[PDB]
Design a protein around this ligand. Structure first.
Ligand code: HNI
Ligand code: HNI
Ligand code: HNI
Ligand code: HNI
Lengths: 141, 146, 141, 146
């Protein structure tokens, strides 16, 4: 469960991220594709070339979904309902990959937030991303 | 990752009693029922809307034969699973775009199917040997991903 | 979430287990220790070999907890509240191991329930054990 | 894993700039903070009541330094990680009873710490090389478990 302290940590951290969110989303995807090449099996239809505009576009979509999740951290299952439907019924990414992307988002945030990425915020961010992942896989079966 | 000579003998002994075509269809079917997101690779196979629709699906059954046929052939090469499954690894990555996690899921379902079929004969040590095998096969199939 | 059919399936299958619950719990634990030796790291004080009184005793406890969960299948977070406290604050078993025991419980049930372990019931049992596992790790952080 | 010559070079180059003492203390500390159930192994380390107490704990810092020191030595055996960590593998299994999943958790925390310290210098390709390393080390430490 996201504690009141978690929610404040997440809101503050993502607030600092601001309009860099889309960029950081794309960076996290690139880190994921390089570090965990099996995740590319979900994007055979993508252009995965360096600096791919298609990957950048997708990074913005992922980031915008996270921004919305932060804004509705008290009620994420409802806020992410349509997206959860799409993941369960169409995308059907195996649940193990959400941990890989979450890790790469954490690494991205760490690399861009030298001051804000405290151990406590690190912990809260990890819980938040795990919670989002849980919602997105909640309707799988 | 490797099995003791006692375990190798146990694997071979049990497998001699396995109808590979049948168990293949059962294992692939149960994969798609128990973990239904795995149906994402089989849109062309037709009706997958119910457990019976999956288990009795002729294309699921046919593919199960093929998959467990390759699995069966690999049991003759337990000392070189990565070599044995190298070209199938490359194919599942480059052409089929199958997340290797699916190989791990299938392995676990296969173990359940073997238990279901053999009952008490599927002893805890026999299970342990087969867990070594399915982990080895899944790791081998994952090995050439890039 | 467990569907109406899931709950029907779980109640029927666990009911058919009946008086064998403790026996099957111990067998599942043995299967886990043999198949997944890393799980033995949590029982350094146990005799873990076949015919162990400690494993038989622990199997009974695990099975009885599952029986309670089945009886309170629509309120497992509260029915298992004390147990989830113990896991989070004392036992602190890494979450990955719950999937290993769950798998071995399925194998045990499959080996003992030829008629009952249909694909649909297999699916429901897997969901049920994953739900119990989620409850038991829900207070970890 | 198998590292390419290009990645072996990148790993060794970044590590030449690492303060193993600080990074070790930071890595072990954040493990205990982010995944607090891992505190189960360190009751004898005293005060682990709060994040600051964990991070500032002398025994946490000292142990982190020792652990990362062995990690550092392992980087001289990148093509034989299983060989060099074989002794410590057996130790963590039989004497310390540490679930190897913890090695994977520490590996990911270590990557986060490196990213936090190096910032943009911790590029996606550099991260990918270090993911191979921490996976390789975790697998090597797990390899002799029984
Ligand atoms: C490794 C695979 C993978 C993971 C872990 C993942 C995890 C996540 C997470 C986790 C925090 C979020 C917030 C998220 C958000 C999104 N994903 Ni993800 N997605 C993944 C692979 C995809 C794919 C594939 C698509 C379809 C993209 C396309 O354009 O075809 C996708 C599509 C989307 C969309 C677009 C929906 C739409 O167009 O209506 C959003 C938003 N996502 N994905
Ligand atoms: C859930 C997805 C999935 C899993 C778990 C899986 C697991 C396995 C395993 C594990 C033990 C083995 C040995 C195996 C072997 C094979 N698979 Ni897999 N395959 C999977 C998805 C596929 C798909 C998809 C195809 C192509 C099917 C088609 O439409 O022709 C395939 C095709 C094959 C073929 C035929 C190759 C060709 O067409 O040239 C073999 C052989 N395989 N598969
Ligand atoms: C791999 C490790 C592991 C797993 C996966 C696991 C998963 C589960 C599951 C999953 C479905 C259930 C229902 C369950 C139930 C229980 N466990 Ni588990 N436990 C585990 C390791 C333990 C340990 C260790 C103990 C302490 C036993 C002892 O006697 O010291 C324990 C104790 C218990 C007890 C006894 C509580 C008490 O004494 O008050 C119950 C009940 N459990 N455990
Ligand atoms: C979460 C727990 C945990 C993790 C992730 C971990 C990960 C690692 C890694 C990962 C890269 C390495 C290289 C490593 C190396 C070592 N560990 Ni770890 N160990 C862990 C739990 C321990 C414990 C517990 C001890 C003994 C404590 C003590 O008394 O010093 C230990 C002791 C050691 C020692 C000292 C051996 C001796 O005294 O002879 C070394 C060296 N290790 N540990």
């Amino acid at each position: 469960v996201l504690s009141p302290a978690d929610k404040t940590n997440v809101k503050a951290a993502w607030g600092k991220v601001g309009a860099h969110a889309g960029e950081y989303g794309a960076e996290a995807l690139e880190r994921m594709f390089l570090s965990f090449p099996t995740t590319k099996t979900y994007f055979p239809h993508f252009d995965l070339s360096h600096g791919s505009a298609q990957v950048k576009g997708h990074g913005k979509k992922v980031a915008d979904a996270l921004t919305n999740a932060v804004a509705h951290v008290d009620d994420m299952p409802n806020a992410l309902s349509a997206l959860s439907d799409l993941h369960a019924h169409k995308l059907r990414v195996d649940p193990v990959n959400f941990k890989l992307l979450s890790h790469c988002l954490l690494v991205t945030l760490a690399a861009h937030l030298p001051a804000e990425f405290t151990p406590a915020v690190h912990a809260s961010l990890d819980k938040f991303l795990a919670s989002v992942s849980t919602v997105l896989t909640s309707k799988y079966r | 990752v490797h099995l003791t000579p006692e375990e190798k003998s146990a694997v071979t002994a049990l497998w001699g009693k396995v109808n590979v075509d049948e168990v293949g269809g059962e294992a692939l079917g149960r994969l798609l029922v128990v973990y239904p997101w795995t149906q994402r690779f089989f849109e062309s196979f037709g009706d997958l809307s119910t457990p019976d629709a999956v288990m009795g699906n002729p294309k699921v059954k046919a593919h199960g034969k093929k998959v467990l046929g390759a699995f069966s052939d690999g049991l003759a090469h337990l000392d070189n699973l990565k070599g044995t499954f190298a070209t199938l690894s490359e194919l599942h990555c480059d052409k089929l775009h199958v997340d290797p996690e699916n190989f791990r899921l299938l392995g676990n379902v296969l173990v359940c199917v073997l238990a279901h079929h053999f009952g008490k004969e599927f002893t805890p040590p026999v299970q342990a040997a087969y867990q070594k095998v399915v982990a080895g096969v899944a790791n081998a199939l994952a090995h050439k991903y890039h």
